[PDB]
């Protein structure tokens, strides 16, 4: 549906076509992250460090537990009904997240039946027997540091030094914690917070968390970096200072009839100036409909664009029309920077601004000349099996498109200035001339 | 002043109303961060690691000390005078920050009278007696690591291993340092740099810094995450390699007659398409004047929006007029993504795009039908005490607004495309049609 020939003529060189994947079908695993280390092996000279740490951690965790209890006290089985009056104000995502929190409350209670065992956990990773057939895992923050650094050195340093080191470790853990579990966490109910953010409760070590829970190795890293492996805090304990996090392990599902077309931006020549067209570099085509996509929220991979949700966004009529051939409607922007892509390789074919980049033919030793009325030059086997563009030498292939590509002129779009302040000034000028008319 | 009924009819569901808080009245505390550890307990085989570290740290700190001395040498008391000619070029914020730096120079000199005691600080946190009634605290970077890891293991590993570990620790500290105290820090005079950034001089452990200085626990976390607890480097020592930072502990003041109204965005139907209105999700109303707010710079809390400054920004006439009822002036954007909020809960009342989300009435077992001429459906007690929207079951309340809400049609705004490239293309098209006219 995209007129790739005309797009390449205005510098939109056809890039890698990627399939569109969105997280689906989350496998739910509940893990315990005990935010307080077990200092029983060094309690002899702990001092008041643990009490102050408990006070600070309770102050941090109390808003989270209150926001959770907002939904835990207004949700009950019918079939799961939610007290909208008691909730009062909520978004759809937050309401479904409250439903998910309620469904996780059964396993949360089963885990909380092991509160004493969670407290006695003296290793950074411990498996606890929930009901002799289900097991829960406790991730104790800083327990590794305690057991590996402080306990082995009780008598090597004075116990006051051990106390100070413990206080410093706890405060560093809190400092790393506060960006995630602090006042920024105003909606702990939502199960959209990534497991990487959740792992700050374990010191940012989400690798240990995920390998301990277990996962499908298929697309695991892709699900991680697409922010698809999310965690939801299910239970907050203000006495044992641990959280229960339900970690959502989704799979990747290919969106039907959806591919994301990357366009490689290449500067071109018009008049005697260098231009790059202002066209999205990632085009989502779904069910033969062209739309934008907020691909910054997604993980771009060599074969697929992997998102945690549908990030399709609408496309204006002019951009859809010019991506389909009406290139006079694709906007272009002046190139005043020396670092702009002068060429790109597409299907073994070079599309180059040979006016701005030195195009030389490595086989016949001749210079590939671009006239002033040409935007790009398509360089392929028919003209130059091997081409030198600057200092890089590229052996080319056959252009599957038109054979009169370099002789067929294209209609050029209108110049634009995509700077924010330039956008405001252009709005000013348009409003002024509109009022004049 | 906001027409919440009409706004909800075009998907702007009334969210949580928040009070507007801005930092004020900073309590100033001066702390010493010794950016070099005391290796006297392990100096036997330290090698040239500390000399190289001193060279690198001096290179890092010299621009900061020079930038400070630009004001310290051009600021005099009569009442505090600055030589504007000697300063030459400065912003208002930087000038007031230079005033703050000058007022902190007295305590800076009082602390620097303890230069020898600062150099002998062999613990990560040490309290020093300034004048037998004032105390200053020294935060020695990596001293905790030295005392906890390297000193206890002098003979366990070869001292060359201790030297290499010390060098690695110092280099890791410098690597974390350079993002904050490096060339990015071109305005150390400004007291707008957060204490979290300042704490990189202590390894990012601002929890230890703030607990050591002491603070009002009221709104402390909210002041941290709003970037209100800022630090100003007051003194840089290039011989003992320590900085004096004045930490500003402000309080929170509620802005008069100011509330920030959150609007929950919900897709609606017009014609046979989904639409979401392009209206700010956070409306600042102050003294009965409607304006935008750059709330990304603020910390949104369940009850208040907490900022380090007034982030109110002007609102265009059309947005103000349509937020007050003229919904034909609120722009809308086509919804092409499958992940859009189809409904929201406001005051126990559901506002749902029942055409796009399946609305079923849990009490009477009937389907809540939305006609094609209806944008949303207000679902409340009068029609459905309990409603099922998809799979989530919500018990509702009474809509305090109109009783003919679902029968009163609204005037619809113009479609837009808020993509940056779409914005540029729309500017192109408007300019073209304007020139044609």
């Amino acid at each position: 549906i995209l007129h790739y020939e005309k797009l390449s003529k205005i510098g939109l060189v056809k890039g890698v076509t990627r399939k569109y994947k969105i997280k689906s079908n989350p496998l739910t695993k509940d893990i315990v992250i005990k935010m307080i280390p077990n200092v029983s092996n060094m309690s002899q000279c702990t001092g008041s460090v643990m009490e102050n740490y408990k006070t600070r951690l309770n102050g941090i965790l109390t808003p989270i537990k209150g926001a959770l209890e907002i939904y835990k006290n207004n949700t009950h089985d019918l079939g799961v009904i939610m007290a909208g009056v008691a909730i009062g104000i909520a978004t759809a995502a937050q309401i479904t997240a409250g439903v998910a929190l309620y469904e996780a409350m059964k396993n949360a209670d089963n885990i909380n039946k092991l509160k004493s065992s969670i407290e006695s956990t003296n290793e950074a990773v411990v498996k606890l027997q929930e009901t002799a057939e289900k097991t829960v895992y406790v991730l104790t923050a800083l327990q590794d540091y305690i057991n590996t650094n402080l306990v082995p050195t009780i008598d090597k340093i004075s116990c006051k030094q051990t106390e100070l080191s413990l206080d410093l470790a706890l405060s560093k853990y809190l400092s790393d914690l506060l960006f995630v579990f602090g006042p920024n966490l105003q909606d702990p109910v939502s199960n959209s917070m990534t497991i990487q953010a959740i792992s700050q409760a374990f010191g940012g070590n989400y690798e240990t968390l995920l390998r301990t829970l277990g996962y499908a190795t298929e697309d695991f890293d892709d699900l991680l970096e697409s922010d698809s492996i999310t965690g939801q805090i299910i239970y907050v304990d203000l006495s044992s200072y641990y959280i229960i996090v339900r970690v959502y392990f989704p799979i990747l599902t290919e969106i039907q009839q959806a591919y994301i077309q990357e366009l490689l931006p290449v500067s071109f020549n018009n008049d005697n100036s260098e231009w790059i067209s202002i066209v999205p570099n990632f085009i989502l085509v779904r069910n033969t409909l062209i739309s934008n996509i907020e691909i910054g929220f997604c993980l771009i991979t060599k074969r697929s664009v992997i998102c945690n949700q549908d990030y399709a966004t609408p496309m204006t009529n002019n951009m859809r029309e010019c991506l389909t051939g009406s290139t006079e409607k694709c906007p272009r922007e002046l190139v005043v920077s020396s670092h702009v892509p002068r060429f790109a390789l597409s299907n073994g074919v070079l599309f180059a601004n040979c006016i701005s980049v030195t195009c030389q033919c490595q086989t016949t030793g001749r210079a590939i000349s671009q006239s002033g009325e040409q935007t790009l030059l398509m360089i392929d086997n028919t003209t130059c099996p091997t081409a030198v563009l600057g200092n890089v030498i590229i052996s080319l292939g056959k252009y599957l498109g038109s054979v009169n590509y370099n002789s067929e002129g294209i209609a050029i779009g209108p110049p634009v200035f995509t700077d924010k302040v330039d956008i405001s000034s252009q709005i000013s000028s348009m409003n002024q001339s509109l009022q004049q008319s | 002043i906001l027409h919440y009924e009409k706004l909800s009819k075009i998907g702007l569901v009334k969210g949580v109303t928040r009070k507007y808080k801005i930092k004020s009245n900073p309590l100033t505390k001066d702390i010493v961060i010794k950016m070099i550890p005391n290796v006297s307990n392990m100096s036997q085989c330290t090698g040239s690691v500390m000399e190289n570290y001193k060279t690198r740290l001096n290179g890092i700190l010299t621009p900061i000390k020079g930038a400070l001395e630009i004001y310290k040498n051009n600021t005099h008391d009569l009442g505090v005078i600055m030589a504007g000619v000697a300063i030459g070029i400065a912003t208002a914020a930087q000038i007031t920050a230079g005033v703050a730096l000058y007022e902190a120079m007295k305590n800076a000199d009082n602390i620097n009278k303890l230069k020898s005691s600062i150099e002998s600080t062999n613990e990560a946190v040490v309290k020093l007696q300034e004048t037998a009634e004032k105390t200053v605290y020294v935060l020695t970077a990596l001293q905790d690591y030295i005392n906890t890891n390297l000193v206890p293991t002098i003979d366990k590993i070869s001292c060359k291993q201790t030297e290499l570990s010390l060098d690695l620790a110092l280099s890791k500290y410098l690597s974390d340092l350079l993002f904050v105290f490096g060339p990015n820090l071109q305005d150390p005079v400004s007291n707008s740099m957060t204490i979290q950034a300042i704490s990189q001089a202590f390894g990012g452990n601002y929890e230890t810094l703030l607990r050591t200085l002491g603070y009002a626990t009221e709104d402390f976390d909210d002041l941290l995450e709003s970037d209100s607890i800022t630090g100003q480097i007051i003194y840089v020592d290039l011989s003992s390699y320590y900085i004096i930072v004045r930490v500003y502990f402000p309080i929170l003041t509620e802005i008069q007659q100011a509330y920030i109204q959150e609007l929950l965005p919900v897709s609606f139907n017009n014609d046979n398409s989904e639409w979401i209105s392009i209206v700010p999700n956070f409306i600042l109303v102050r003294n009965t004047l409607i304006s935008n707010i750059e709330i990304g710079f603020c910390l949104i809390t369940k009850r208040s929006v907490i900022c380090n400054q007034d982030y109110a920004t002007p609102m265009t006439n059309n947005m103000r007029e349509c937020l007050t009822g003229s919904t034909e002036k609120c722009p809308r954007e086509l919804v092409v993504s499958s992940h859009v909020p189809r409904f929201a809960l406001s005051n126990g009342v559901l506002f749902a795009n029942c055409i796009s989300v399946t609305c079923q009435c849990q009490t009477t077992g009937r389907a809540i039908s939305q006609s094609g001429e209806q944008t949303l459906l207000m679902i409340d007690n009068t029609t459905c005490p309990t409603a099922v929207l998809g799979n989530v079951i919500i018990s509702l309340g009474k809509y305090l607004g109109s009783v003919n809400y679902n029968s009163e049609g609204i005037a619809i705004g113009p479609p837009v495309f808020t993509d940056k490239v779409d914005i540029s293309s729309q500017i192109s098209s408007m300019n073209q049609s304007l020139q044609q006219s």
Partner: antibody
Amino acid sequence: VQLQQSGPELVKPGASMKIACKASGYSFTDYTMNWVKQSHGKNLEWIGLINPYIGGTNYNQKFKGKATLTVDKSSSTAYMELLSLTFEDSAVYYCARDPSRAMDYWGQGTSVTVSS
Amino acid sequence: DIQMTQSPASLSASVGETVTITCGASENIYGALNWFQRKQGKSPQLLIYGATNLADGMSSRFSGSGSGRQYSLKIGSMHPDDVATYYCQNVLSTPWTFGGGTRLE
């Protein structure tokens, strides 16, 4: 909560046929439907799932190309178009509702036979 | 694919005595194992999901356990009704495979 299959069909080899799976009693869009192939009355094997909410599909490698899953959100119906039918494609085909990972509600199944 | 194996392919025991239906997995599936009951001529019914959780509407005598790659479905006291075929389904990795099947008579 019901899943209505299209019904047993007699289809010629090399042809293409479509299983209909009407849904009722629940939110069709908010549940994923899986498809499984019951061959020889004993062996079960998962064909693929379709997420009607997002339009996404996840196929078994064995069934890529042979089976394509579509949905009809207007009719709350999910389809399984079977391509290039052979004798091995003669089996019992189920549509199973899936919240995320547990096929709790199944269609009655379509015993599809491939012959002339 | 994860090969999902059931040891007692065909088992017949007296009514009212404990029955353990063991299932195995080629790879560790971390409790992402579903159990399905397929009576003769009828669609498989979700029996136990998550390798421990009893599915709603199912009898309390189904007490399936297990962790890692080796699992087990327990019947306890039989009844003539649960004479069916039991399938343990892999759920961890995307090609959600099934076990061979246990026909209990």
